[PDB]
Amino acid sequence: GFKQDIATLRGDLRTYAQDIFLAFLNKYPDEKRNFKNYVGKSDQELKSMAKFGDHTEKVFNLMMEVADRATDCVPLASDASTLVQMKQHSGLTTGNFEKLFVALVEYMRASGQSFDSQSWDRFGKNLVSALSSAGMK
């Protein structure tokens, strides 16, 4: 289930994080509007760019914590508020997170592994709802 998937991802978190975020950027190339420095770079070039490696690592370290603190894939409202109030996220909207989780679910379904993709689909929808309630446009 969802809780075991958190353990699976955490057990190889750097590789999963970079692969899922790359899947996001390659499924939705226009999302580089928020990452101008990512333009004109292959996956392997991005993986050697410090700001990509560091942001991606932060994304998934904190996402696994938010998932871990969730009940039945519903995040804490306080976790959603913290995400909304992050300064570097000022230009984001719920659509950015929606797309991230569509790519993550697609990645899990395509993997060879026993991920509970339905739970991650719910988690992403419930996070988006919570971000909206917390003030994200």
Added chain:
Amino acid sequence: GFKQDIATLRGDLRTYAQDIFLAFLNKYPDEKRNFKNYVGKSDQELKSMAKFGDHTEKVFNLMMEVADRATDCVPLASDASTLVQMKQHSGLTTGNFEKLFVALVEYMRASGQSFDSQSWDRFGKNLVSALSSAGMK
């Protein structure tokens, strides 16, 4: 407290893992007996090797899983058994773990961040006791 410290560490897991492991290796030079491939390299030379960060991150992920599953800083006997039975740990005794947590507590106390160093010292002691109970010499 302890639970928040797990969240702090997980929030920047690779960085904290490398810095705490380096603190251990430098406090106890003989402990590189179990790390032949790290001999003859400075802290920054080690951090530059992707395998060092990869290994340290995976170690500390399991450490955080054991810490999060603990009750009042007492680890589960089943988690201690896992650590005893790991093939990678066949050469080890509890003193190896005692020294790791002495260095970890020293790192936390010098950090100037608000770690609950007392709880981590207790956790390390209770982990050592639990490793002994699970069959480590």
